[PDB]
């Protein structure tokens, strides 16, 4: 309740660059100066501001303290998996967060 | 199971000596018509066969015994207890740093669990 | 209790003679024992079948498990997560490994049984090693598809 209060949105413009694999998206986020990874978690669209007809999908969307969420539509039901501590990176001397 | 450690402590002794990484005393026992279950990283003892094989590979320093003699750990109570000493401060630094990531990932995990996950922005 | 295998998983079209009718052809069982509840008067799903040997025993429990019995998982056997509505033909260390995919596993795992039979009690209590695991056990693992049987995995204690 004290983290969600004092946690400022001023909500900027994120740069999401995806690619697809084959055996991954990065996400370039300024320096936030402070050891708080950005966390990725998958949801439901059955939850909205406005809640839209025809909403049947899931969204991943990764977050941070200093910057605003930025959230990707999965059509598919389970081609990878949305696990922090499984497949993602968050490399702080260049500031890149890596997911796949 | 003595057999089987018997067997894995013999391949640790014949592969130890070998000079090259593929041309060992082993690799060609298994085209030789001889079952060993145990060269292949698949199973769980190929994990307990390279410590064995390590351990025969660092009996093998010229420190451990083979041209020198040992004079500090034999001959020296105080360096061994400054070892120990040493290695106690080592395993108190590990638990530090093991604590500092528990607190990390408390940390983590509270802040994970007080973001606002309705802003969605599909840009 | 060593010839005598208790079964679990049993739904409302299984009865007391339809079990050792069916576990007949496995061994003799001499005798079918079913609990009643206090509240409604009926069988809790778990169940007991005395045989005359252990071998027969043994047979059953190496034969009717996790058997899809009256559309129920039946199997037999020798007689901060809360996971609930769980098959009875897991085992600890079954639990631990389907668990292991998730995240790493604290401890081994325990599963709550009956004072009575002590087979099954139908909930159980497994702990992760950090809230990572948790939340992807709570994502993933809280209504994953399990031996016909849907769990459902959720928080033991949480502080608002």
Same mark, same amino acid.
């Given at each position: ?31 936030? #100066? *402070? +050891?708080?990874?950005?966390? /990725? ?40 998996? #949305? *696990? +922090?501590?499984?497949?993602? /990176? ?11 | ?123 | ?160």
């Amino acid at each position: 309740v004290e983290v969600k209060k004092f946690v400022k949105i001023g909500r900027p413009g994120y740069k999401v660059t995806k690619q697809r694999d084959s055996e991954l998206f990065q996400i370039d986020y300024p320096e936030i #100066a *402070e +050891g708080i990874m950005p966390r /990725h978690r998958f949801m439901s669209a059955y939850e909205q501001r406005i809640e839209p007809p025809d909403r049947r999908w899931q969204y991943l969307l990764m977050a941070a303290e200093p910057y605003e969420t930025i959230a990707f539509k999965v059509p598919s039901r389970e081609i990878d998996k #949305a *696990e +922090g501590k499984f497949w993602t /990176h968050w490399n702080r001397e260049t500031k890149q967060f890596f997911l796949q | 199971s003595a057999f089987d450690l018997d067997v894995v402590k013999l391949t640790a002794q014949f592969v130890a000596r070998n000079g090259r990484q593929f041309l060992t005393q082993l690799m060609q026992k298994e085209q030789r018509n001889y079952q060993f279950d145990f060269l292949r990283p698949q199973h769980s003892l190929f994990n307990y066969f390279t410590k064995l094989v390590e351990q025969y590979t660092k009996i093998l320093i010229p420190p451990k015994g083979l041209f020198s003699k040992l004079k500090k750990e034999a001959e020296n109570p105080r360096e061994v207890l400054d070892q120990v000493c040493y290695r106690v401060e080592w395993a108190k630094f590990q638990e530090r740093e093991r604590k500092k990531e528990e607190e990390e990932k408390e940390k983590e995990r509270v802040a994970y669990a007080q973001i606002d996950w309705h802003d969605f922005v599909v840009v | 209790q060593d010839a005598t295998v208790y079964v679990g998983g049993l739904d409302e079209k299984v009865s007391e003679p339809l079990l050792w009718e069916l576990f007949l052809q496995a061994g003799p069982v001499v005798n079918t024992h079913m609990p009643k509840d206090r509240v409604t008067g009926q069988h809790q799903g778990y169940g007991f079948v005395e045989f005359l040997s252990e071998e027969d025993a043994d047979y059953a429990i190496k034969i009717m498990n996790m058997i899809k019995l009256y559309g129920k998982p039946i199997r037999v056997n020798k007689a901060n997560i809360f996971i609930g509505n769980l098959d009875p033909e897991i085992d600890e260390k079954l639990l631990y490994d389907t668990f292991s995919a998730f995240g790493v596993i604290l401890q081994t795992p325990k599963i709550m049984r009956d004072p009575d039979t002590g087979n099954s009690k139908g909930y159980a209590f497994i702990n992760f090693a950090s809230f990572d695991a948790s939340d992807a056990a709570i994502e993933a693992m809280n209504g994953q598809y399990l031996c016909n049987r849907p769990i459902t995995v959720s928080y033991a204690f949480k502080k608002d």
